[PDB]
Design a protein around this ligand. Structure first.
Ligand SMILES: CCCCCCCCCCCCCCCCCC(=O)OC[C@H](COP(=O)([O-])OCC(O)COP(=O)([O-])OC[C@@H](COC(=O)CCCCCCCCCCCCCCCCC)OC(=O)CCCCCCCCCCCCCCCCC)OC(=O)CCCCCCCCCCCCCCCCC
Ligand SMILES: CCCCCCCCCCCCCCCCCC(=O)OC[C@H](COP(=O)(O)OCCN)OC(=O)CCCCCCCCCCCCCCCCC
Ligand SMILES: CCCCCCCCCCCCCCCCCC(=O)OC[C@H](COP(=O)(O)OCCN)OC(=O)CCCCCCCCCCCCCCCCC
Ligand SMILES: CCCCCCCCCCCCCCCCCC(=O)OC[C@H](COP(=O)(O)OCCN)OC(=O)CCCCCCCCCCCCCCCCC
Ligand SMILES: CCCCCCCCCCCCCCCCCC(=O)OC[C@H](COP(=O)(O)OCCN)OC(=O)CCCCCCCCCCCCCCCCC
Ligand SMILES: CCCCCCCCCCCCCCCCCC(=O)OC[C@H](COP(=O)(O)OCCN)OC(=O)CCCCCCCCCCCCCCCCC
Ligand SMILES: CCCCCCCCCCCCO[C@@H]1O[C@H](CO)[C@@H](O[C@H]2O[C@H](CO)[C@@H](O)[C@H](O)[C@H]2O)[C@H](O)[C@H]1O
Ligand SMILES: CCCCCCCCCCCCO[C@@H]1O[C@H](CO)[C@@H](O[C@H]2O[C@H](CO)[C@@H](O)[C@H](O)[C@H]2O)[C@H](O)[C@H]1O
Ligand SMILES: CCCCCCCCCCCCO[C@@H]1O[C@H](CO)[C@@H](O[C@H]2O[C@H](CO)[C@@H](O)[C@H](O)[C@H]2O)[C@H](O)[C@H]1O
Lengths: 115, 174, 51, 83, 171, 97, 97, 140, 48, 347, 112
């Protein structure tokens, strides 16, 4: 309960502040005021147009690396096993294969952003 | 009402799925999936799987972050679609919520519901284990056994992740 | 066996390679200034960006 | 041994970060083999009692099984008291 | 499918050791040594019978030995023992290491008056034998008779009579 | 398996996780440990064709432990009746219930 | 079955219909695939946790690892589809009719 | 289908034709709907009406074939006092083939449909008289 | 509670075996207060 | 692709199949399928053209969906049995989901639409892997769960596959689409006999693989991917046309060729179970496969189509493709009927 | 045995003769493969690479010998199982009381 109470209070306070912020100030709304900002001159095209990702290959590799942590995060518990000979071999095996995958992408220029 | 904590989360779980299954802009589909991951973590947490719950939430938060980046580059249009902006999206969204509501209404109205298969609506607490006094988490011992017992599982998973890096680079090198 | 639904079908390319699209990928155009901390207040630098 | 030294010193000047990594990674793999304390780690993990020590039904011929926890028979943790 | 046999509420009644866990934790080490025999017999019963109903009587002897244990502390070491678990009770994790000074006072009190010795590290986790007159249960799982195995195919292997006998083939 | 290389070579690649009556870390037992073991021991060596018929009791009990469908139906029957009697002013729960 | 299963099973079905009924963006369909794994992960975890089968507590983790590979594989293909046609629309993938 | 198929065989041949025709009409309509679902899914109609208009033709064509088969097969047996006669289904099968040809505007289909549907139905009647299995239970 | 229900048998088992079965939460706290049930089921998981 | 990378990826494709075949645990079987799909896509994309990209995307979407249904079946089996062993499934809904999941992975009708397109979009060597090696893992799982498969469902897929494969091949002029539809038709025979005698499923599978491997290897030798391109083979390598003829007639099941054996053995097994209407229907419908095998033999071996002047330049150069195992496979594809009783080794 | 090409119990069966007609056919198949190999690569069919031709024959016979041995063993196993089962279930395989045609009746169908 306590955790749910704590989360509700946090996001309840934040919402109350936004509500106050929107209904306390005097407003004067017109088209020029609310037009999109771009350094004084009108935007040239839509901000919804595609925005090329140069680090796309690193971004996919993050998905694969970001799952190594789930496999490695149990290590503090695994260190309490009776079978430490098997543990340490398998823990070191995973990290090395992760290191090898990183080296492969590095040596094959996968971490360089496309121009 | 609080005894139905897991059921209430599961209702929001399905609603998140209707959120992205209706397939609006992937910006909002990702939002729906983040919510489902959140209450999905809550569901698993309430069954004693704090580690399992927090991790599916963590993994899916990173995944949708990559998805958001890819959406702005490759799945964006001038007028991204919200659930109200399209008849096909709204029709699917409305249909899924009404199909969700009625299932909830009957199971709560009767404490059981038949939706293709019989489901008991007594609350999910009734199936829980009564006794427990071990001085450890059972999920943690089971998960930690991956390194002692699961030698074969570590090899195949480690290999697949390594191959995954090699494969994605081949696929994307036009 | 020709049919009306397949009247528009051509045999595939000999070497399996279809021509690249003539479509031009559009670069984002941005006003960098004048009202910008790095524009010295009166430079309207119109940049074409890819990413 | 001279060719390797030039390479080794060369990488110490260009990629000291990677030199440090491989060295530490190498130590992580080697020292557990050569350490005289590695054996105690498994013994301490073995000596931690997570579960109840279920008693045995005495049949008459269990000389090494103790009758009381304070009896001399049974595994002793004296090595751990002094570790 | 049967009516579960549950004991009467009188057969379940017993004197309860109504003290807090910090009290039990403070006296656990001495309690383990003093009440080992009734406790070990009761625990042997549960892991053999696999039935709480079949071990009730031994479970009452566990309480009667616990009450007698705590009655001796009250007669001779009430005040030193009372400081010690109070110190344990304060801690959020009821840690021993925060009450070593008071643990001593209680430890030499029970040694001087009662002759009790604290178990060494590892003593209470030993597997110990225990003599009992309760007969060993014979079908603790209430298993039915298992189905008979398939009659073994044995004998001397001889060539197939006229070979494969597949249509026209003569071999 | 299709090719039982595990039995031939004696290695144990994945059989350890197959059943909940197998050796668990620190001997933590599953909730339906006894029911599984009875069904596995009933049907051992006799084949599925025979086991489907000669171990229905063991399997049926094991299925009850897994999904508790008969138990939950019984509770819903008791709970539903109490609602009827409580709502009619006929039965009153004791203090502890 | 327990009532939670009703919504988790429903969640899988919703994403399955979500995957089978395409629109235009290929990215939208790749989300319905991650949706199916999420429900499979949750429903496996409930079964494993509730039944106290300790050794399979690692099973949902392994499930996520091979979901990440599929998503990374799916995103890689979306990159090359986009680089060819300038969108991720699935109606552009009809050369092989 | 299992239950709907059973009820058709449940009632005696040559009697209660209204019920027999209801069964075959139901079998006809279900087959038309299944063809309509695949047809619209794989060959998208231009408009929602033409998708309904395409479902209308196929479902009606299939329901008409079954209704005429059940009617003709029942009435033929009733007239001829021969319930378990394979020939009764031969006449039902041809009439159905004629309906397809009539509904299709092509004497080529109507004739070919008569023969193949006529022989197929008689084999069905032979099949349950003699106990032929199309999906046979593994026994050896 | 089940006196006037005809087909009922009080304390019947759902198991063909006579072996003792650990009761689940619903079996043990089935007819009790919500806060007692709530503490028994989610008390530990919710405790801070 | 670096040669070393191709070998490692190629070994991973085999590794996933082997993991499925030696696994006694449903999770490891699913892992094996994922490992296989991960490693095959880069082989499909090897030449990096829009068509190969389309094929890889269509393949990935199909195989991913099947994996989801397969894993769903496994979890349902776990709920109703509490175990993971690879064997019969304890829930009929789990059996349906697994059977359909495997049907998509095989490309059986009506889950067949991807096979013609993926095959056409990728190189011949990749298509050989797709239509031969990729059949092993799903079939090996079907070989273990068949006691719990719904008979009507499996036979319905078999009948539909034979019909749809037979009719689909009649309209094709591309050799890769002909092999796709031929593959769909042959998969129907394998699963039709599966409920009755799983051994004849293995026999049909092996003989199908030998004959399919031979045909792809001969297409690679002359780098032919269309009916007309293949029609020039007589003017460069006359021997090759004769081997294509014999192999094609064998694929059509004509005695006394090896391809008649699996059809012969399957009819025997089905009749022993008093299944007469189905093997008769199957054998006749397979005549559709023979018809579009005979067209290829007409344009390839039994007639001579026109050539082109530039063909004379190829007379001066020898074949340099590896053609690995081709002499052995073609002999096994044609001259094995006298050794039919050797099928007991598969028992 | 489990996952074994030739279980040890198979050694009680007489091995295939080296002059087995089925083994001679296998050897012939190797000869044909050897000839096809010369043909496709466009060498003199009968003469070229006799070292290669001998390996085609030898390898086919080598593999064929073991396949024929396993084939024979699996048929011996089938008979061993069948006969023991008949022994184990006498009630399902009862001897037929065999009438003679003098005692049995057959309706006669004239061919007029
Ligand atoms: C457990 C319970 C089950 C759990 C699931 C419950 C549902 C929860 C919601 C799940 C998400 C659903 C996602 C739906 C979706 O993405 O649709 C995209 C899909 C394509 O979207 P789009 O790209 O924007 O194209 C819009 C036009 O339709 C483009 O078409 P057009 O421009 O050509 O316009 C003419 C149109 C006209 O269509 C016709 O020809 C009329 C046919 C009438 C047949 C009678 O042609 C068609 O579109 C033919 C489609 C007909 C569908 C086949 C039906 C037979 O949209 C639709 O097809 C509409 C479906 C919306 C309602 C979905 C209902 C959900 C329940 C499904 C059945 C579940 C059974 C179990
Ligand atoms: C598993 C159990 C499933 C049972 C159902 C099996 C049916 C699967 C058939 C799917 C492949 C069929 C492909 C095909 O034949 O073409 C699709 C067809 C569209 O053709 P259609 O619109 O009907 O005719 C136009 C005339 N100019 O659409 C159709 O009409 C085919 C309908 C076949 C259904 C019988
Ligand atoms: C015993 C039990 C098993 C029973 C099953 C049946 C066994 C037979 C299986 C055959 C297996 C395939 C091997 C066939 C070998 C064919 C050899 C041959 O015909 O000569 C090749 C000849 C080459 O012509 P050339 O240019 O002079 O030489 C170039 C090569 N160095 O090529 C040509 O020039 C011919 C070009 C014209 C094409 C003529 C086509 C009609 C004649 C074909 C005869 C072969 C038919 C095979 C089909 C199966 C028959 C059962
Ligand atoms: C295939 C030869 C016929 C060629 C014409 C093609 C006919 C169509 C083939 C379709 C399949 C029908 C096969 C019919 C033959 C198989 C039936 C049979 O004969 O089985 C028994 C055979 C041993 O024959 P057996 O009666 O025991 O006499 C031994 C004498 N030494 O055991 C066997 O199974 C052996 C069968 C292989 C063929 C006979 C081998 C003879 C030994 C020399 C090796 C062959 C070399 C010559 C190759 C001839 C190729 C045409
Ligand atoms: C007992 C044998 C019975 C045979 C039964 C046949 C059953 C069908 C078997 C199908 C497989 C057929 C073999 C595969 C095709 C290979 C043949 C070919 O591709 O074309 C024919 C070829 C001639 O073409 P060419 O370029 O001139 O080669 C030079 C040879 N001088 O090559 C040829 O010249 C013809 C090859 C076939 C003739 C085989 C001869 C048997 C071996 C005789 C031993 C050598 C005798 C040498 C004699 C000279 C010394 C005195
Ligand atoms: C079902 C009942 C019927 C049973 C059928 C049995 C089928 C399985 C039997 C194996 C079939 C393949 C037989 C291949 C024979 C030809 C091999 C040969 O002569 O190679 C010659 C030469 C390489 O020879 P070399 O590598 O030095 O031999 C040592 C191998 N470690 O280099 C060359 O020029 C050879 C090129 C032609 C060969 C095609 C390419 C394949 C390469 C194979 C490599 C060598 C294989 C060694 C075979 C040993 C088999 C025991
Ligand atoms: C590309 C693939 C790369 C794979 C790389 C894998 C690297 C693995 C290196 C070996 C790691 C473990 O190495 C091994 O650890 C155990 C300790 O746990 C040591 O074992 C030692 O301690 C254990 C307990 O701790 C005692 O039971 C044992 O008596 C003692 O020998 C071994 O002496 C050491 O050899
Ligand atoms: C077990 C964990 C610890 C082990 C370390 C694991 C990670 C190893 C990372 C790869 C190291 C070798 O692979 C790496 O390849 C690239 C080739 O593009 C080399 O060279 C490149 O690197 C640097 C920085 O990018 C550039 O300035 C240089 O111009 C470029 O040539 C790197 O000098 C080398 O470090
Ligand atoms: C393609 C969409 C996939 C969507 C998947 C949706 C979830 C599927 C849930 C599968 C489990 C349903 O389970 C189905 O219903 C109940 C479950 O107790 C069973 O109910 C029936 O079978 C058991 C058999 O002993 C008995 O209780 C009795 O015969 C009957 O009640 C069904 O035999 C079972 O097949």
């Amino acid at each position: 309960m306590n955790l749910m109470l704590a989360l509700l209070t946090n996001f309840t306070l934040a919402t109350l502040l936004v509500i106050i912020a929107f209904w306390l100030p005097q407003l004067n709304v017109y088209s020029e005021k609310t037009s999109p900002y771009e350094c004084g001159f009108d935007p040239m095209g839509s901000a919804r147009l595609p925005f090329s990702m140069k680090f796309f290959l690193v971004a996919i590799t993050f998905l694969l690396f970001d799952l190594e942590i789930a496999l490695l995060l149990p290590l503090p518990w695994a260190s309490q096993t009776a079978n430490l000979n098997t543990m340490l071999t398998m823990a070191l095996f995973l990290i090395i294969l992760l290191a090898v995958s990183l080296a492969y992408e590095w040596t094959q220029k996968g971490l360089e952003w496309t121009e | 009402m609080m005894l139905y904590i897991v059921f209430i989360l599961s209702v929001i779980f399905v609603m998140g799925f209707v959120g992205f299954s209706s397939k609006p802009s992937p910006i909002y589909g990702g939002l729906g999936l983040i919510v489902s991951g959140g209450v999905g973590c809550g569901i698993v947490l309430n069954f004693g799987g704090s580690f399992l719950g927090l991790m599916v939430f963590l993994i899916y938060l990173g995944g949708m972050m990559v998805v958001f980046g890819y959406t702005t580059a490759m799945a964006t249009e001038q007028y991204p679609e919200i659930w109200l902006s399209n008849k096909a999206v709204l029709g699917a969204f409305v249909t899924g919520l009404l199909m969700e509501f009625f299932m909830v209404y009957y199971v709560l109205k009767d404490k059981e519901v038949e939706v293709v298969f019989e489901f008991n609506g007594l609350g999910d607490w009734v199936i829980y284990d009564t006794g427990d006094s071990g001085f450890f988490s059972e999920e943690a011992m089971g998960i930690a056994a991956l390194y002692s017992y699961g030698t074969w599982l570590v090899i195949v998973t480690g290999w697949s992740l390594l191959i995954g890096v090699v494969v994605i680079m081949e696929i994307t090198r036009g | 066996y020709p049919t009306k639904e397949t009247a528009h079908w051509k045999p595939p390319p000999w070497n399996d390679v279809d021509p690249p699209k003539d479509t031009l990928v559009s670069n984002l155009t941005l006003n960098f200034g004048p009202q910008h901390p790095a524009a010295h207040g009166v430079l309207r630098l119109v940049m074409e960006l890819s990413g | 041994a001279e060719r390797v030294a030039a390479f080794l010193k060369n990488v110490w000047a260009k990629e000291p970060v990677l030199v440090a990594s491989f060295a530490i990674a190498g130590l992580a793999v080697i020292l557990p083999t050569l350490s005289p304390y590695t054996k105690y780690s498994l013994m301490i993990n073995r000596a931690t009692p997570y579960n109840y020590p279920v008693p045995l039904r005495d049949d008459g011929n269990m000389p090494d099984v103790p009758s009381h926890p304070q009896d001399p028979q049974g595994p002793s943790l004296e090595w751990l008291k002094r570790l | 499918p049967g009516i579960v046999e549950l004991p009467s509420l009188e057969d379940l009644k017993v004197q309860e050791v109504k003290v807090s866990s910090s009290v039990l934790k403070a006296a656990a080490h001495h309690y383990g040594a003093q009440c080992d025999k009734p406790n070990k017999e009761f625990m042997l019963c549960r892991w053999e019978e696999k039935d709480p109903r079949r071990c009730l009587e031994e479970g009452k002897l566990v309480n009667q030995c616990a009450l007698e244990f705590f009655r001796q502390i009250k007669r001779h070491c009430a005040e030193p023992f009372t400081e010690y678990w109070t110190c344990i009770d304060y801690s959020g994790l009821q840690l021993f290491r925060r009450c070593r000074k008071q643990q001593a006072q209680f430890d030499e009190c029970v040694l001087d008056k009662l002759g009790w010795v604290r178990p060494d590290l590892g003593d209470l986790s030993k597997v110990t034998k225990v003599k009992t007159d309760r007969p060993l249960p014979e079908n603790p799982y209430h298993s039915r008779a298992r189905p008979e195995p398939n009659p073994e195919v044995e004998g001397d292997l001889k060539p197939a009579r006229h070979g494969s006998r597949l249509f026209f083939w003569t071999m | 398996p299709f090719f039982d290389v595990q039995k031939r070579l004696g290695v144990d690649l994945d059989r350890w996780m197959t059943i909940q009556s197998a050796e668990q870390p620190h001997k933590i037992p599953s909730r339906c440990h006894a029911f599984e073991k009875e069904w596995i021991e009933c049907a051992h060596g006799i084949g599925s064709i025979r086991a489907e018929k000669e171990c229905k009791i063991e399997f049926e009990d094991f299925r009850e432990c897994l999904l508790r469908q008969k138990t939950m139906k019984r509770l819903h029957a008791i709970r539903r009746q109490r609602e009827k009697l409580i709502k009619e002013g006929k039965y009153t729960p004791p203090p502890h219930h | 079955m327990s009532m939670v299963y009703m919504n988790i099973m429903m969640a899988f079905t919703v994403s399955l219909v979500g995957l089978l009924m395409y629109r235009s963006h290929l990215m939208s369909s790749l989300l319905c695939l991650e949706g199916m794994m999420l429900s499979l992960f949750v429903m496996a975890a409930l079964t494993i946790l509730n039944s106290h089968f300790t050794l399979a507590s690692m099973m949902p983790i392994i499930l996520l690892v091979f979901a990440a590979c599929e998503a990374a594989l799916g995103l890689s293909l979306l990159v090359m589809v986009s680089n060819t046609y300038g969108t991720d629309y699935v109606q552009n993938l009809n050369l092989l009719q | 289908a299992k239950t709907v198929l059973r009820q058709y065989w449940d009632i005696p041949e040559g009697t209660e034709c209204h019920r027999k025709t209801y069964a075959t009409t139901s079998i006809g309509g279900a087959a038309g709907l299944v063809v309509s679902a695949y047809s619209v899914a794989l060959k998208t109609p231009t408009s929602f009406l033409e998708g309904v208009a395409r479902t209308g033709r196929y479902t009606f064509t299939a329901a008409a074939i079954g209704a005429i088969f059940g009617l003709t097969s029942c009435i033929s047996a009733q007239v001829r006092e021969k319930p378990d006669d394979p020939l009764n289904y031969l006449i039902g099968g041809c009439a159905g083939g004629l309906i397809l040809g009539a509904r299709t505007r092509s004497y080529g289909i109507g004739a070919a449909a008569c023969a193949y549907m006529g022989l197929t139905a008689a084999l069905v009647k032979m099949g349950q008289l003699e106990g032929w299995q199309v999906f046979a239970e593994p026994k050896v | 509670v089940m006196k006037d229900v005809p087909g009922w048998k009080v304390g019947e088992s759902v198991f063909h075996t006579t072996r003792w079965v650990t009761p689940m939460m619903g079996e043990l706290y089935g007819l009790r207060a919500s806060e007692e049930v709530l503490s028994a089921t989610y008390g530990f998981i919710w405790y801070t | 692709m670096n040669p070393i990378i191709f070998i490692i990826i190629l070994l991973t494709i085999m590794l996933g199949t082997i993991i499925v075949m030696i696994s006694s645990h449903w999770l490891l079987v699913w892992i094996g399928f994922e490992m296989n799909m991960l490693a095959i896509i880069p082989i499909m994309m090897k030449n990096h053209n829009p068509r190969a990209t389309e094929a890889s995307t269509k393949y990935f979407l199909t195989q991913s969906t099947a994996s989801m249904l397969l894993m769903m079946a496994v979890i349902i089996n776990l709920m109703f049995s509490g175990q993971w062993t690879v064997m019969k499934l304890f829930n009929p809904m789990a059996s349906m989901l697994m059977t359909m999941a495997l049907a998509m992975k095989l490309g059986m009708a009506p889950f067949h639409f991807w096979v013609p397109e993926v095959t056409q979009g990728i190189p011949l060597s990749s298509g050989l892997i797709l239509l031969t090696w990729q059949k092993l893992a799903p079939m090996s799982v079907l070989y273990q769960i068949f006691p719990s498969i719904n008979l009507n469902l499996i036979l319905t897929l078999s009948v539909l596959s034979i019909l749809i494969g037979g009719w689909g091949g009649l309209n094709q002029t591309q050799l890769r689409k002909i092999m796709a539809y031929s593959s769909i038709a042959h998969m129907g025979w394998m699963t039709a006999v599966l409920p009755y005698n799983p051994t004849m499923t293995l026999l049909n599978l092996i003989i199908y693989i030998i004959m399919t491997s031979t045909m792809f290897t001969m297409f690679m030798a002359n780098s032919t991917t269309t009916t007309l391109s293949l029609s020039h083979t007589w003017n460069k390598t006359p021997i090759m046309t004769v081997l294509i003829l014999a192999t094609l007639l064998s694929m059509g099941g004509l005695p006394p060729l090896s391809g008649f054996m699996p059809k012969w053995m399957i009819i025997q097994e089905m009749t022993k179970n008093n299944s007469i209407i189905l093997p008769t229907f199957m054998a006749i419908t397979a005549l559709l496969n023979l018809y579009f095998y005979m067209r290829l033999t007409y344009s390839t071996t039994l007639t001579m189509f026109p050539s082109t002047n530039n063909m004379k330049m190829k007379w001066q150069f020898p074949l340099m493709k590896k053609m690995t195992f081709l002499p052995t496979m073609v002999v096994l594809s044609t001259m094995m009927l006298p050794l039919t009783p050797m099928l007991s080794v598969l028992e | 045995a489990t996952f074994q090409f030739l279980p040890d119990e198979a050694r009680s069966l007489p091995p295939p003769k080296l002059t087995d007609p089925r083994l001679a056919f296998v050897g012939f198949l190797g000869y044909c493969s050897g000839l096809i190999d010369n043909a496709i690569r466009r060498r003199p069919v009968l003469l070229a690479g006799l070292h290669r031709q001998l390996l085609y024959i030898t390898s086919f016979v080598f593999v064929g010998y073991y396949l024929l041995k396993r084939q024979d063993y699996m048929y011996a196993v089938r008979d061993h199982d069948m006969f023991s089962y008949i022994k184990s279930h006498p009630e399902d395989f009862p001897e037929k009381d065999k009438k003679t045609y003098g005692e049995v009746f057959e309706e006669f169908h004239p061919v007029r």
